[PDB]
Design a protein around this nucleic acid. Sequence first.
RNA 1: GCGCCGUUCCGAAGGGACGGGCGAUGGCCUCCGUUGCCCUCAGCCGAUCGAAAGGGAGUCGGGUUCAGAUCCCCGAAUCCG
RNA 2: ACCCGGUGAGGCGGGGGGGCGAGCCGGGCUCUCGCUUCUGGCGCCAAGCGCCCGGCCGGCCGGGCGCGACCCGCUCCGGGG
Lengths: 68, 233, 57, 100, 118
Amino acid sequence: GAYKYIQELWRKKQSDVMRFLLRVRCWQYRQLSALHRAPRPTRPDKARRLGYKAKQGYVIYRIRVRRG
Amino acid sequence: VVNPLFEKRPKNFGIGQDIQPKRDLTRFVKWPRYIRLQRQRAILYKRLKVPPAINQFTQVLDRQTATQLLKLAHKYRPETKQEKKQRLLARAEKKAAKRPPVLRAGVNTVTTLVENKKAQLVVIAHDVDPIELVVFLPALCRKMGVPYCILKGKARLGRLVHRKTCTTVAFTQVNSEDKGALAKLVEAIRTNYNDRYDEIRRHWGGNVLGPKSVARIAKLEKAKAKELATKLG
Amino acid sequence: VRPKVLMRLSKTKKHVSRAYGGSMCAKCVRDRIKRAFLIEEQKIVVKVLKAQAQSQK
Amino acid sequence: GRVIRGQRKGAGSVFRAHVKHRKGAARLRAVDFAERHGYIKGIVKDIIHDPGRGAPLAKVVFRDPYRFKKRTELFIAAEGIHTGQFVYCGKKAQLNIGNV
Amino acid sequence: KIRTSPTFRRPKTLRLRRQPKYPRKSAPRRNKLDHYAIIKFPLTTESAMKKIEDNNTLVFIVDVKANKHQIKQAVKKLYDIDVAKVNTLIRPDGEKKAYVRLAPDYDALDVANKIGII
RNA sequence: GCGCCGUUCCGAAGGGACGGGCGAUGGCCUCCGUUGCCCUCAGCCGAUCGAAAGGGAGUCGGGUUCAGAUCCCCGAAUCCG
RNA sequence: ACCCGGUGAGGCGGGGGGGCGAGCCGGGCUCUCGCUUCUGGCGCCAAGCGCCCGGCCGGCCGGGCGCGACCCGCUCCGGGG
Ligand SMILES: [Mg+2]
Ligand SMILES: [Mg+2]
Ligand SMILES: [Mg+2]
């Protein structure tokens, strides 16, 4: 299906498309607050690997950690 | 006839002459943070060097073809929850006393039947919020030889089905009544995309500056052009 | 008197029957009237001189 | 040994400034359409002495060109400005003492 | 619609009132500060009897959570008599001594003999 | 990490009120209050605490107790709603 | 991307419209301007024009929109980078 293509597409991070997406996403999330709700996952495939399903009561919070 | 007491009293809206009126000020609103984020995000999508795997979603199949594609997809809409109960009631009455072809939605079912080589036309919405779901699918339809089209709005594609949003729609099988128009749409979509996918790969994105900076650079270039014209004569 | 007492006093006890009553003294009132007349007359003179400048030019 | 006096001055709570009797911050007018293109006139109401400052300040009353409300500003009174004086402010203003 | 002010405040959205499906508690709590519970006893002090005989009052001992209007309505209900005014103090014992000044149509000595104190 | 910094600083920070329109009620359905919606209006400044000597409306005389009196009694007023 | 200053984030950039100067044969073109300086006055909640419709009997009473107050825009203006 589509999940294996999405999986190795999230794997190959050093490519131009994925570096562009990580740069735009990191910029947008840096403008966002330190702790907020993402109503849908940014990585749906990795969420389904970790155990996230699409039903009521499964919430995802996007938070930031100060690096160092 | 007229009343001579009706004096015309114009206000001179000069600098420091009179108070200024409440004119339109939509540009100078101190907007909230989410509006200010979502505007300059699209501004950065205009500015930054967009790779062709994201730039392929910027070309949309036009309106006159999209209306015919919606007219074709309206005939083969999937079942409703009430229509499922009606068909189960009819099956129960038949038990007491061939399925038609429908849409196949979802990137999983769509890509599985494209590698199974069952699709004849694959509809894509251009405006998915995680873009990595649908990046591989145009080149995958290129390799499998499947016609793919890209349309504006996932809401108008998800209201063909009885849901909210829908990314990819596959046209697996059609009847004999809806074959010729389907072939005429397949031919136009194929000559739009599959014949010219290599130029889509070569076409980079972005590198478009803002209008003020473009106007300033164009002013300096036209000034230097007028200078280099008037020295030669 | 103290300011919260002024609810008790009548209307005539708190101001004077005059333009700018109880806010400005009468000398500065009549000076402000003279100024408000004379700056307006100066604007009329400047308008007449501008009309004459447009008449010559 | 102990924490030295220059280190104790940086912490605060004793060595802070005495800003109670001070009237306010001596700040100019912000940039706008009148400061940018033309000019706008304002009267000098009164000159006051500010504590903790050798320079005297001036209450300059401006007229707001956008909303009907008289603004006040704490200008730094230069030597030669008297009360009842029209201080102009803008780009098209003239060059004399009591003008920015 | 044109933007008049440059500031963008929060728009006045619609909110609803409390329409609960079931109340929080089952029964409303009964008045534990009853009229009988708010008046403990009248005093039989010689000074209190001198105050009753002279200044046409009644001296009561009251729970500390009371109001002057509560003492007034409590005396009016449980003694069937009109009250001119109520003067309250809190004793160092803990309870509230209440000098209830009555109206001069009734007699303080007569109502004291009626309620039994002497 | 218990929590810390920060008081206008990286905030959609108002629930307020004049007038008009509509429907629902209440009272000799006269005329007006009460709430519900919509149109319309609006700058503020930082939630809150912080002086029994700071600002702060308005009470004095006589008499009375073994102990209380600008408080209790009498006679005079006065402030706010 | 990132940093600083101001604001109640109030006219920022181009294209229009008009006037004042120079040269050419009423016309286009390079540039400036855009209404306030003898005075311790006042200045908001539109005057004027046009197009509408609602009720009453050409007349009476109550309202809306656009000009006045140019248009298009993708960062609030600047300063670093
Ligand atoms: Mg220390
Ligand atoms: Mg307090
Ligand atoms: Mg105090």
